[PDB]
């Protein structure tokens, strides 16, 4: 028993991990089979990251000006193609280290772990959530960007996040693998409005199911509610709309338990009215909405 | 910027992470050199386990008994002995992904990543503390047991706890790598008192150090306190009583903050009288402890 914010084992991600500079700007890159895929601002000087025009930027470099290292070895860069918001280095040499992988995007409230980096070296893993407004909450200094977010499924790596940016407000935006942004955000240093976020409710009821079957259940209460009444409160504390189809995906956490999800709901409802009252649930005094239904499944079984 | 629960990368421990069985019995082993490390009651039954004598479980074992295996394959067995509450079985071939390594005991108080495992396999990776009374807040299911805690410095891998087992109580209990225990706890079936525990002082502190670094600055005050009148604070709260040598611990961050390590006391004295007043400090209702000084240093410095 215990639940704690649990990541994936990073190691098939670690073998992934090279430094690619180009000028003066060193950042991270992920090599998987014959490309290194990076943040494109990696050709940008500070005096270009106002406003970068990032194509006259890339018609200056040629493969030799990306210095791409893995651990003490450098390798040899054949080709160079900007997708979106990464660049794509050939390299000559397949990782031998690859992975069985994936490129995925993520949907928002969906959680991933995070392979912090910084010159091509590992610092730390740790589980995040995408927000509902598509940024992260990270931990991220300069130097980490080219960082990736990842799910395993058995054997099989899908990496679902790239680093790229930390906001003036402190929150961090990336990007799918494809290079695309989550959320409105633009590789520029320029202030960027995230938009509203929310917690995400079918997160906060698997964390409550999760509490539940280690031994929390003080918040449990003799009533229930609808979707319609749940919604209205959720609505006046700025949570998702519940719909049945987070009500299914929480079906073997209730099936579980014993405990209907409307049920939940409404031990759910009673904690947002009234607080928790000075007391903690799971070793928080807040609602946490960083666990998704599968991760708690995942964690209360022990899947390997 | 940016704060999470961080652990170390976890790819050097899982290279070591192999399955020991033994009759109907299989847990965890570690695998460093030619020497596989396991919590001894993996020779128990269920109806050993009540009081086991451990001395005549293991003399009906011979190395053929000790199934070990590290992924697909078998190895050899060609030793066996029992150290405290630890089986180190010989193998015939030293482990070819053997980091630098160490073994080490922790203090109460200090923090380590644990990699989940299960059947020799890793579920995930997680940071914890060292609870004052030896116990730790885990997240371990049944099949755990032989899962390691540990630190990394630059390459080498210090090894602080092998998992053994959960109480009636929930909490965690483990020893150290020559198999002795953290705290007063046996490896048997048996309700165990743990004892009073306290909250962390000189690791709250460095997690509102931490606030400071990250932006969350609302909880600082006009006032300060001296060692003497913030441990009468921190015995009516259960905190540790802070020393001189936590408060040298607290030295860099106290000068990259500029804020003196009696300031900061004095604010870690008002949340306590006071609380938090429906406030977060870096996502948290309640005040951290499972964060050191050396952790705030090294994630606030992007240490790889
Ligand atoms: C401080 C930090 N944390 N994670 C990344 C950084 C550095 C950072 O924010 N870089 C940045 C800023 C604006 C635009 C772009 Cl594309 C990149
Ligand atoms: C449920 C669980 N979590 N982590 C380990 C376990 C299994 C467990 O508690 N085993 C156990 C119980 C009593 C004594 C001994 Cl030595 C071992």
Redesign the interface.
């Given at each position: 028993?215990?639940?704690?914010?649990?990541?994936?084992?990073?190691?098939?991600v670690?073998?992934c991990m090279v430094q690619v500079t180009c000028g003066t700007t060193t950042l991270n890159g992920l090599w998987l089979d014959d490309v290194v895929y990076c943040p494109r601002h990696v050709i940008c000087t500070s005096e270009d990251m106002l406003n970068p025009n990032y194509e006259d930027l890339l018609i200056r470099k040629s493969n030799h000006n990306f210095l791409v290292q893995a651990g003490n070895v450098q390798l040899r860069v054949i080709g160079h193609s900007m997708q979106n918001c990464v660049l794509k280095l050939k390299v000559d040499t397949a990782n031998p280290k690859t992975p069985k992988y994936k490129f995925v995007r993520i949907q928002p409230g969906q959680t991933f772990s995070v392979?912090?980096?910084?010159?091509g070296?590992?610092?730390?893993?740790?589980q995040?959530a995408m927000r509902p407004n598509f940024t992260i909450?990270?931990?991220?200094?300069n130097?980490?960007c080219g960082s990736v977010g990842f799910n395993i499924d058995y054997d099989c790596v899908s990496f679902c996040y790239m680093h790229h940016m930390?906001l003036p407000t402190?929150?961090?935006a990336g990007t799918d693998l494809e290079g695309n942004f989550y959320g409105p955000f633009v590789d520029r240093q320029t202030a960027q409005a995230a938009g509203t976020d929310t917690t995400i409710t079918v997160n906060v009821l698997a964390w409550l199911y999760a509490a539940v079957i280690?031994?929390d259940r003080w918040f449990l209460n003799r009533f229930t509610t609808t979707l319609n009444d749940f919604n209205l409160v959720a609505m006046k504390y700025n949570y998702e709309p519940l719909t049945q189809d987070h009500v299914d995906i929480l079906g073997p956490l209730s099936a579980q338990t014993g405990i209907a999800v409307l049920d939940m709901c409404a031990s759910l409802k009673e904690l947002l009215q009234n607080?928790?009252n000075?007391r903690?649930i799971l070793?928080?005094?807040?609602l946490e909405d960083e666990f998704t239904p599968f991760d708690v499944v995942?964690?209360?079984?022990?899947?390997?």
């Open positions: 028993s215990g639940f704690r914010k649990m990541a994936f084992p990073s190691g098939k670690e073998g392979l912090a980096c910084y010159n070296s590992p610092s730390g893993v740790y995040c909450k990270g931990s991220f200094l130097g980490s930390e402190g929150v961090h280690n031994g607080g928790m000075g903690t070793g928080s005094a807040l995942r964690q209360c079984s022990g899947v390997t």
